[PDB]
Coordinates of C-alpha atoms and ligand atoms in Angstrom, one line a residue:
Chain A
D4 CA 12.4 -8.4 -10.9
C5 CA 13.0 -7.3 -7.5
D6 CA 16.5 -7.2 -5.9
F7 CA 17.4 -8.6 -2.4
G8 CA 16.1 -6.2 0.3
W9 CA 13.0 -5.1 -1.8
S10 CA 9.7 -6.6 -1.5
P11 CA 7.4 -7.1 -4.5
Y12 CA 3.8 -6.0 -4.6
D13 CA 1.7 -5.4 -7.7
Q14 CA 4.5 -4.9 -10.0
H15 CA 6.4 -2.4 -7.7
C16 CA 9.2 -3.0 -5.2
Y17 CA 9.3 -1.8 -1.8
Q18 CA 11.9 -1.2 1.1
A19 CA 11.8 0.4 4.5
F20 CA 15.1 1.9 5.3
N21 CA 15.9 2.4 8.9
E22 CA 18.3 5.5 8.3
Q23 CA 16.7 8.6 9.6
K24 CA 16.4 11.4 7.2
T25 CA 14.8 14.5 6.5
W26 CA 12.0 14.2 4.2
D27 CA 14.2 15.7 1.3
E28 CA 17.2 13.5 2.3
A29 CA 14.9 10.4 2.3
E30 CA 13.4 11.4 -1.4
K31 CA 17.0 12.0 -2.8
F32 CA 18.2 8.7 -1.2
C33 CA 15.3 6.8 -2.9
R34 CA 16.2 8.4 -6.2
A35 CA 19.6 7.1 -6.0
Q36 CA 18.4 3.6 -5.4
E37 CA 18.5 1.1 -8.3
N38 CA 17.0 2.6 -11.5
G39 CA 15.6 5.3 -9.4
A40 CA 12.8 5.2 -6.8
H41 CA 10.8 7.5 -4.7
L42 CA 9.5 7.8 -1.1
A43 CA 6.4 5.5 -1.5
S44 CA 3.0 6.7 -2.8
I45 CA -0.1 5.1 -1.4
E46 CA -2.5 4.7 -4.2
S47 CA -5.0 2.2 -2.8
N48 CA -6.3 0.2 0.1
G49 CA -4.4 -3.0 -0.8
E50 CA -1.1 -1.0 -1.0
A51 CA -1.7 0.8 2.3
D52 CA -2.2 -2.7 3.9
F53 CA 1.0 -3.9 2.0
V54 CA 3.2 -0.9 3.1
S55 CA 1.9 -1.3 6.6
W56 CA 2.7 -4.9 6.6
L57 CA 6.1 -4.1 5.3
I58 CA 7.0 -1.6 8.2
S59 CA 5.6 -3.8 10.9
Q60 CA 7.8 -6.5 9.7
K61 CA 11.0 -4.4 9.6
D62 CA 12.7 -5.1 13.0
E63 CA 14.9 -2.1 13.2
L64 CA 11.8 0.0 12.8
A65 CA 11.7 0.0 15.8
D66 CA 9.8 1.3 18.2
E67 CA 10.1 4.2 15.5
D68 CA 7.2 6.9 15.6
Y69 CA 7.0 8.0 12.1
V70 CA 8.0 6.8 8.6
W71 CA 8.2 9.1 5.8
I72 CA 6.1 8.4 2.6
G73 CA 6.2 10.6 -0.5
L74 CA 3.3 13.1 0.4
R75 CA 4.4 16.8 0.1
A76 CA 2.5 19.9 -0.1
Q77 CA 3.3 22.2 -3.0
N78 CA 2.3 24.5 -1.2
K79 CA 2.2 27.4 -2.1
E80 CA 1.7 30.0 0.8
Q81 CA 3.5 28.9 4.1
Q82 CA 0.2 27.8 5.8
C83 CA -2.8 26.6 3.9
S84 CA -5.7 28.4 5.5
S85 CA -6.6 31.0 2.8
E86 CA -9.0 33.0 4.9
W87 CA -9.3 34.2 8.4
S88 CA -12.5 33.2 10.2
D89 CA -13.9 36.6 9.4
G90 CA -13.9 36.1 5.7
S91 CA -10.9 38.3 5.0
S92 CA -7.9 36.8 3.2
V93 CA -4.3 36.4 4.7
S94 CA -1.8 38.8 3.5
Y95 CA 0.4 39.5 6.5
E96 CA 1.7 36.4 8.0
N97 CA 4.1 36.0 11.1
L98 CA 5.6 32.5 10.5
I99 CA 9.2 33.4 11.5
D100 CA 10.3 30.8 14.0
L101 CA 7.6 28.2 13.0
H102 CA 8.2 25.2 11.0
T103 CA 5.6 23.8 8.5
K104 CA 3.8 20.6 8.6
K105 CA 3.9 20.1 4.8
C106 CA 5.2 16.5 4.5
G107 CA 3.2 13.4 5.1
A108 CA 4.3 10.5 7.3
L109 CA 2.8 7.1 8.6
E110 CA 2.7 6.8 12.4
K111 CA 3.2 4.0 14.8
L112 CA 0.2 4.7 17.1
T113 CA -2.1 4.5 14.1
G114 CA -0.8 1.1 12.7
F115 CA 1.2 2.8 10.0
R116 CA -1.8 3.4 7.8
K117 CA -3.4 6.8 8.5
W118 CA -1.4 9.7 7.0
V119 CA -0.1 12.5 9.3
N120 CA 1.2 15.8 8.1
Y121 CA 4.4 16.5 9.8
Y122 CA 7.6 18.7 9.8
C123 CA 9.7 18.0 6.8
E124 CA 13.1 18.8 8.6
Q125 CA 12.4 15.9 11.1
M126 CA 14.6 12.9 10.4
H127 CA 12.8 9.5 10.2
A128 CA 13.0 6.1 8.5
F129 CA 11.2 5.9 5.3
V130 CA 9.8 3.6 2.6
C131 CA 10.8 3.7 -1.0
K132 CA 8.8 2.3 -4.0
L133 CA 10.3 1.5 -7.2
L134 CA 9.0 0.4 -10.7
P135 CA 11.7 -2.2 -11.5
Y136 CA 13.4 -1.3 -14.7
Chain B
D1 CA -16.2 54.7 20.1
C2 CA -16.2 51.0 20.9
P3 CA -18.5 49.5 23.6
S4 CA -17.0 49.9 27.0
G5 CA -14.2 47.3 27.8
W6 CA -13.4 47.1 24.0
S7 CA -10.7 48.9 22.2
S8 CA -10.5 50.5 18.6
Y9 CA -7.8 50.4 16.2
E10 CA -8.4 51.5 12.7
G11 CA -12.1 51.2 12.4
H12 CA -12.3 47.7 14.3
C13 CA -13.0 46.8 18.1
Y14 CA -11.1 44.4 20.0
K15 CA -11.4 42.5 23.4
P16 CA -9.0 40.1 25.1
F17 CA -10.6 37.2 27.0
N18 CA -8.4 35.3 29.6
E19 CA -10.3 32.1 29.5
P20 CA -9.0 28.9 28.2
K21 CA -11.2 27.7 25.5
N22 CA -10.4 25.3 22.4
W23 CA -10.4 27.1 19.0
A24 CA -14.1 26.3 18.1
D25 CA -15.3 27.2 21.7
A26 CA -13.5 30.6 21.3
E27 CA -14.6 31.4 17.8
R28 CA -18.1 30.3 19.2
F29 CA -17.7 32.8 22.1
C30 CA -16.8 35.6 19.6
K31 CA -19.8 34.8 17.5
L32 CA -22.1 34.9 20.7
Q33 CA -21.0 38.6 21.3
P34 CA -24.0 41.2 21.2
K35 CA -22.3 42.6 18.1
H36 CA -21.5 39.4 16.4
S37 CA -17.7 39.0 16.2
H38 CA -14.8 36.7 15.2
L39 CA -11.4 35.5 16.5
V40 CA -8.9 38.3 15.8
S41 CA -7.3 38.5 12.3
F42 CA -4.2 40.5 11.5
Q43 CA -3.8 42.4 8.4
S44 CA -0.7 44.2 9.3
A45 CA 2.4 44.1 11.8
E46 CA 1.1 47.4 13.5
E47 CA -2.4 45.6 14.3
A48 CA -0.4 42.8 15.8
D49 CA 1.7 45.2 17.7
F50 CA -1.6 46.9 19.0
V51 CA -3.2 43.6 19.9
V52 CA -0.3 42.3 22.1
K53 CA -0.3 45.7 23.8
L54 CA -4.0 44.7 24.7
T55 CA -3.1 41.1 25.6
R56 CA -0.2 42.0 27.8
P57 CA -1.7 43.4 31.0
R58 CA -4.0 40.5 31.9
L59 CA -3.5 37.6 29.3
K60 CA 0.4 37.6 29.1
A61 CA 1.9 35.3 28.7
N62 CA -0.8 32.7 27.7
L63 CA -1.2 31.3 24.2
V64 CA -3.9 33.4 22.5
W65 CA -6.2 32.1 19.6
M66 CA -6.2 34.0 16.4
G67 CA -8.7 33.3 13.6
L68 CA -6.8 30.7 11.6
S69 CA -7.9 27.0 11.6
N70 CA -7.1 23.8 9.6
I71 CA -4.0 25.4 8.6
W72 CA -2.5 22.2 7.1
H73 CA -5.8 21.1 5.3
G74 CA -6.1 22.7 1.8
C75 CA -2.5 22.5 0.9
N76 CA -1.7 21.4 -2.7
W77 CA -0.6 17.7 -1.4
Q78 CA 1.2 15.7 -4.1
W79 CA 3.2 12.3 -4.6
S80 CA 7.0 12.8 -5.1
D81 CA 6.7 10.1 -7.9
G82 CA 3.9 12.2 -9.6
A83 CA 1.0 9.7 -9.0
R84 CA -2.5 11.1 -8.9
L85 CA -3.5 11.9 -5.3
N86 CA -6.8 10.1 -5.7
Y87 CA -6.9 7.6 -2.8
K88 CA -6.8 9.5 0.4
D89 CA -6.2 8.4 4.1
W90 CA -5.6 11.3 6.6
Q91 CA -6.1 11.5 10.4
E92 CA -8.2 13.0 12.4
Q93 CA -6.0 16.1 13.3
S94 CA -6.4 19.9 13.1
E95 CA -4.1 22.5 13.6
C96 CA -4.9 26.2 14.3
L97 CA -2.8 29.3 15.1
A98 CA -2.0 31.2 18.2
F99 CA 0.5 33.9 19.5
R100 CA 2.0 34.3 23.1
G101 CA 0.4 37.3 25.1
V102 CA 3.7 39.0 24.7
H103 CA 5.0 38.7 21.1
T104 CA 3.8 38.8 17.5
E105 CA 5.3 35.3 16.6
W106 CA 2.7 32.8 15.6
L107 CA 2.4 29.2 16.9
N108 CA 0.8 26.2 15.5
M109 CA -1.3 24.3 18.0
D110 CA -3.7 21.4 18.1
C111 CA -7.1 22.9 17.6
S112 CA -8.5 21.1 20.8
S113 CA -6.0 22.9 23.1
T114 CA -7.1 25.4 25.4
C115 CA -5.9 29.2 25.0
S116 CA -7.2 32.6 25.6
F117 CA -8.3 34.6 22.7
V118 CA -9.2 38.2 21.3
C119 CA -12.6 39.1 19.7
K120 CA -12.7 41.7 16.8
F121 CA -15.4 43.3 14.9
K122 CA -16.0 46.1 12.4
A123 CA -17.2 49.4 14.2
Chain C
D4 CA 9.7 35.1 43.0
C5 CA 8.1 33.1 40.0
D6 CA 6.2 34.7 37.2
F7 CA 2.8 33.3 35.9
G8 CA 3.5 30.3 33.5
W9 CA 6.6 29.2 35.7
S10 CA 6.4 26.7 38.5
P11 CA 8.6 27.1 41.6
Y12 CA 10.7 24.2 42.9
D13 CA 13.6 24.6 45.2
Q14 CA 14.3 28.1 44.7
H15 CA 14.0 27.7 40.8
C16 CA 11.3 28.3 38.2
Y17 CA 10.4 25.8 35.6
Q18 CA 8.2 25.9 32.5
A19 CA 7.7 23.5 29.6
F20 CA 7.0 25.0 26.3
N21 CA 5.1 23.4 23.7
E22 CA 6.9 25.0 20.8
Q23 CA 9.0 22.6 19.0
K24 CA 12.5 23.7 18.6
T25 CA 15.8 22.2 17.8
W26 CA 18.1 21.7 20.8
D27 CA 19.9 24.9 19.9
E28 CA 16.9 26.9 19.1
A29 CA 15.4 25.7 22.6
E30 CA 18.4 26.7 24.7
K31 CA 18.5 30.1 22.8
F32 CA 14.8 30.6 23.5
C33 CA 15.3 29.7 27.2
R34 CA 18.2 32.3 27.5
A35 CA 15.8 35.0 26.2
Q36 CA 13.3 34.3 28.9
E37 CA 13.1 36.5 32.0
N38 CA 16.5 37.2 33.5
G39 CA 17.9 34.4 31.2
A40 CA 17.1 30.7 31.8
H41 CA 18.4 27.5 30.2
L42 CA 17.1 24.1 29.2
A43 CA 16.6 22.3 32.5
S44 CA 19.4 20.6 34.3
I45 CA 18.3 17.7 36.5
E46 CA 20.6 17.6 39.5
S47 CA 18.7 15.1 41.8
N48 CA 15.9 12.7 42.2
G49 CA 13.6 15.2 43.7
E50 CA 14.1 17.6 40.6
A51 CA 13.7 14.7 38.2
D52 CA 10.4 13.9 39.9
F53 CA 9.4 17.6 39.8
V54 CA 10.2 18.1 36.1
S55 CA 8.5 14.9 35.3
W56 CA 5.4 16.1 37.1
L57 CA 5.6 19.4 35.4
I58 CA 5.5 17.8 32.0
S59 CA 2.8 15.2 32.7
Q60 CA 0.8 18.1 33.8
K61 CA 1.2 20.3 30.5
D62 CA -1.7 19.3 28.4
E63 CA -0.4 20.5 25.0
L64 CA 2.5 18.1 25.8
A65 CA 1.0 16.1 24.3
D66 CA 1.1 13.0 23.3
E67 CA 4.7 14.4 22.6
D68 CA 7.6 11.9 22.4
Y69 CA 10.5 13.8 23.5
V70 CA 11.2 16.9 25.6
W71 CA 14.5 18.5 25.5
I72 CA 16.5 19.2 28.6
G73 CA 19.9 20.8 28.9
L74 CA 22.2 17.8 28.2
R75 CA 24.7 18.2 25.5
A76 CA 27.9 16.3 24.7
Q77 CA 31.2 18.5 24.3
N78 CA 32.1 16.3 22.5
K79 CA 34.7 16.4 21.1
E80 CA 35.0 13.7 18.2
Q81 CA 31.9 13.0 16.3
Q82 CA 31.3 9.7 17.9
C83 CA 32.4 8.8 21.5
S84 CA 33.8 5.4 21.1
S85 CA 37.6 6.1 21.4
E86 CA 38.8 2.7 20.3
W87 CA 37.8 -0.1 17.9
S88 CA 37.0 -3.6 19.6
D89 CA 40.5 -4.5 18.3
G90 CA 42.2 -2.0 20.6
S91 CA 43.1 0.3 17.9
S92 CA 42.1 4.0 17.9
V93 CA 39.7 5.6 15.6
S94 CA 41.5 8.0 13.1
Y95 CA 39.6 7.6 9.8
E96 CA 35.7 8.0 10.3
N97 CA 32.9 8.0 7.7
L98 CA 30.1 10.0 9.4
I99 CA 29.1 11.8 6.3
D100 CA 25.3 11.7 6.1
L101 CA 24.9 10.5 9.8
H102 CA 23.6 12.6 12.5
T103 CA 24.8 12.6 16.0
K104 CA 23.0 11.7 19.1
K105 CA 24.7 14.3 21.4
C106 CA 21.7 16.1 23.0
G107 CA 19.7 14.8 25.9
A108 CA 16.0 14.4 26.1
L109 CA 13.3 13.0 28.3
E110 CA 11.0 10.5 26.8
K111 CA 7.2 9.8 27.1
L112 CA 7.4 5.9 27.2
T113 CA 9.8 6.0 30.1
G114 CA 7.8 8.5 32.1
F115 CA 9.7 11.7 31.4
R116 CA 12.5 10.6 33.8
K117 CA 15.2 8.5 32.2
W118 CA 17.5 10.5 29.8
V119 CA 17.8 9.5 26.2
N120 CA 20.7 10.8 23.9
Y121 CA 19.1 12.0 20.7
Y122 CA 19.7 14.0 17.6
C123 CA 20.1 17.7 18.3
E124 CA 18.5 19.0 15.1
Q125 CA 15.1 17.2 16.0
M126 CA 12.5 19.6 16.9
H127 CA 10.7 19.1 20.2
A128 CA 9.0 20.7 23.2
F129 CA 11.4 21.6 26.0
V130 CA 11.6 22.6 29.7
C131 CA 13.5 25.7 31.0
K132 CA 14.8 26.2 34.4
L133 CA 15.5 29.6 35.8
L134 CA 17.1 31.2 39.0
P135 CA 14.7 34.1 39.6
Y136 CA 16.7 37.3 39.6
Chain D
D1 CA 48.6 -15.9 2.6
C2 CA 45.5 -15.8 4.7
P3 CA 43.6 -19.0 5.6
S4 CA 41.4 -20.3 2.7
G5 CA 38.1 -18.3 2.5
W6 CA 39.8 -15.1 4.1
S7 CA 41.3 -12.3 2.2
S8 CA 44.5 -10.2 2.8
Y9 CA 44.8 -6.4 2.7
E10 CA 47.9 -4.8 4.0
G11 CA 49.0 -7.4 6.6
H12 CA 45.5 -8.4 7.8
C13 CA 43.0 -11.0 6.9
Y14 CA 39.2 -10.4 6.4
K15 CA 36.1 -12.6 6.1
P16 CA 32.5 -11.6 5.5
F17 CA 29.7 -13.5 7.2
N18 CA 26.3 -13.2 6.0
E19 CA 24.6 -14.2 9.2
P20 CA 22.4 -11.7 11.0
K21 CA 23.7 -11.4 14.5
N22 CA 23.5 -8.6 17.1
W23 CA 26.9 -6.8 17.6
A24 CA 27.9 -8.8 20.8
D25 CA 27.1 -12.1 19.2
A26 CA 28.9 -11.0 16.0
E27 CA 32.0 -9.7 17.9
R28 CA 31.6 -13.0 20.0
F29 CA 31.8 -15.1 16.6
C30 CA 35.0 -13.3 15.5
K31 CA 36.5 -14.0 18.9
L32 CA 35.6 -17.6 18.4
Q33 CA 37.7 -17.9 15.1
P34 CA 40.6 -20.5 15.1
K35 CA 42.9 -17.4 15.0
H36 CA 41.2 -15.1 17.6
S37 CA 39.8 -12.1 15.7
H38 CA 37.5 -8.9 16.0
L39 CA 34.9 -7.1 14.0
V40 CA 36.5 -5.2 11.2
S41 CA 38.0 -1.9 12.0
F42 CA 38.9 0.8 9.3
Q43 CA 42.0 2.7 9.4
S44 CA 41.6 4.3 5.9
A45 CA 39.2 4.9 3.0
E46 CA 41.2 2.4 0.9
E47 CA 40.7 -0.4 3.5
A48 CA 36.9 0.5 3.6
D49 CA 36.8 0.2 -0.2
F50 CA 38.6 -3.1 -0.1
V51 CA 36.1 -4.5 2.5
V52 CA 33.0 -3.4 0.5
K53 CA 34.6 -5.2 -2.4
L54 CA 34.4 -8.3 -0.3
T55 CA 30.8 -7.7 1.1
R56 CA 29.3 -7.0 -2.1
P57 CA 29.2 -10.6 -3.9
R58 CA 27.2 -12.1 -1.1
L59 CA 26.4 -9.7 1.8
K60 CA 25.2 -6.7 -0.3
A61 CA 23.1 -5.0 0.6
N62 CA 22.7 -6.0 4.3
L63 CA 24.1 -3.9 7.2
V64 CA 27.3 -5.1 8.3
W65 CA 28.6 -4.6 11.8
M66 CA 31.9 -2.9 12.2
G67 CA 33.8 -2.9 15.4
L68 CA 32.4 0.4 17.1
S69 CA 29.9 0.0 20.0
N70 CA 28.5 2.3 22.7
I71 CA 29.2 5.3 20.5
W72 CA 27.1 7.7 22.5
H73 CA 28.5 6.5 25.8
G74 CA 31.8 8.3 26.7
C75 CA 30.9 11.7 25.4
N76 CA 31.8 14.7 27.5
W77 CA 28.2 15.4 28.7
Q78 CA 27.5 18.7 30.3
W79 CA 24.7 20.9 31.4
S80 CA 23.9 24.1 29.3
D81 CA 23.7 25.9 32.7
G82 CA 27.1 24.8 33.7
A83 CA 25.8 22.8 36.7
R84 CA 28.1 19.8 37.6
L85 CA 26.9 16.5 36.0
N86 CA 26.9 14.7 39.1
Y87 CA 23.5 13.0 39.5
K88 CA 22.9 10.8 36.4
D89 CA 19.8 8.8 35.0
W90 CA 20.5 7.4 31.6
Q91 CA 18.5 4.4 29.8
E92 CA 19.2 1.5 29.0
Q93 CA 20.2 1.9 25.3
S94 CA 23.4 1.3 23.3
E95 CA 24.3 2.1 19.8
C96 CA 26.7 0.5 17.4
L97 CA 28.2 1.3 14.0
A98 CA 27.5 -0.5 10.6
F99 CA 27.8 0.1 6.9
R100 CA 25.8 -1.3 3.9
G101 CA 27.2 -4.1 1.9
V102 CA 27.5 -1.6 -0.9
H103 CA 29.1 1.8 0.3
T104 CA 31.5 3.2 2.9
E105 CA 28.9 5.3 4.7
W106 CA 28.5 4.4 8.4
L107 CA 25.1 4.0 10.1
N108 CA 24.2 4.2 13.8
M109 CA 22.1 1.2 14.9
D110 CA 20.7 -0.2 18.1
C111 CA 23.3 -2.8 19.3
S112 CA 20.6 -5.4 19.5
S113 CA 19.7 -5.3 15.9
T114 CA 20.8 -8.1 13.7
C115 CA 23.3 -7.7 10.7
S116 CA 26.0 -9.4 8.9
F117 CA 29.6 -8.6 9.8
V118 CA 33.2 -8.9 8.7
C119 CA 36.0 -10.5 11.0
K120 CA 39.7 -9.2 10.8
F121 CA 42.9 -10.3 12.3
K122 CA 46.7 -9.5 11.8
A123 CA 48.4 -12.1 9.7
Ligands
CL201 CL1 -12.2 36.6 31.1
CL202 CL1 -5.1 21.1 10.0
CL203 CL1 27.6 -17.2 6.3
CL204 CL1 25.7 4.1 23.0
NA205 NA1 -3.9 -7.6 -2.5
NA206 NA1 -10.7 40.4 2.0
NA207 NA1 -13.6 51.5 28.4
NA208 NA1 -11.3 52.7 22.8
NA209 NA1 10.8 17.3 47.3
NA210 NA1 46.4 2.1 17.9
NA211 NA1 40.7 -18.9 -0.9
NA212 NA1 44.0 -13.7 -0.3

């Protein structure tokens, strides 16, 4: 039972929002939609194709580089390389003034299919996925 | 001490190389040293302060490779809706870490960009 | 008297930094360089051509969409349309959850020449301009 | 009161129109009303709350044009180095303001996107 603005696919409902939000703002927004949605997960080929068609069809969208989906690293360090190339492990880190690429996005130049890790605090358009009631 | 042209700090030998290579070519070059060696690793602030002292005279202020590659790879990626991350579809992209020849601050770069680098081995 | 990393043009020194900073972080960074630089101003055709050549020559750069320059609105309202289309002036505003496009950038798809107002809190590469000592 | 199909709030008449137009075409359409009218303006929160009450039954949840265009145009732009903003080279770009048919929150959009809209005139 999808609402106007949402597109059905495979028992879920999807909507690409042209508001530009941080990855956290986008997820929170999605949760506040209908009976509570999330940034889209992509769980298959078919769905990747669907989400990709959904975006490429949203006209406000735009010319837009990146589109958030629900991918986030968890993490737990602030970079994910556990060892230096000499086999030693990383204890001291100097990540002051460096932003992390721990949120996943779809990208215009790769047809909104391939996943790109990118900076979470960057504002972009996004896709919500919902299981209707 | 350390072979000529190299510098010791705390049981290890270091050399700067002002020669733009991509991360792999730079780590390659280190491995090719007569004593087999790697891109510098940092275990402390004081070791970083010593290495920038080395980089400064000739390399500063180029980006310099340190030995951390694929820094966004083995993160614990998940879906915000809790679905299993089973299906996957990532680019085709790798990041590596560098610092300027003048400060201790790290910088995430495309692994196929071209920087200077420092080699390091145990004495 | 330009330093290594800086390019001379017309008595000034320029450098495109591939670090991705907020417009405020970028300007602050620039001020902390040499005897104190700023995000680049573009004051002519020649200089626009120069800055544009400078970027298109920086290899890390990249494939990068936007490059901050020193353009900022001042402002003073949070949107710059003083009147509604009915001639009345704007007193109530609902800009909660809306980010402002009050910082100026050069853009890849327009040859790093034409100026684009864009969101200040977006992190990008940037160009500093310096008057050497 | 207000002509049939229009609604009054506080001496003014309002009508929603569910018909994607770009900002100019939408403001055009309002001007074309038998009583010449404009895209809705908001002078208070309570007027915004009344207009969304109107939009909801049929327009929700489309973006709806309000009467604010070129919102990034006449800003007091300056150079951070203090140079005179004499030479200029802007795109070729215009933004306009809209709200969703369901909340009072404004949204900046390209003026050539296509939304619904509300017309407004004085009674
Ligand atoms: Cl060399
Ligand atoms: Cl990586
Ligand atoms: Cl209609
Ligand atoms: Cl505008
Ligand atoms: Na299918
Ligand atoms: Na170890
Ligand atoms: Na020596
Ligand atoms: Na020595
Ligand atoms: Na010239
Ligand atoms: Na007025
Ligand atoms: Na009526
Ligand atoms: Na009425």
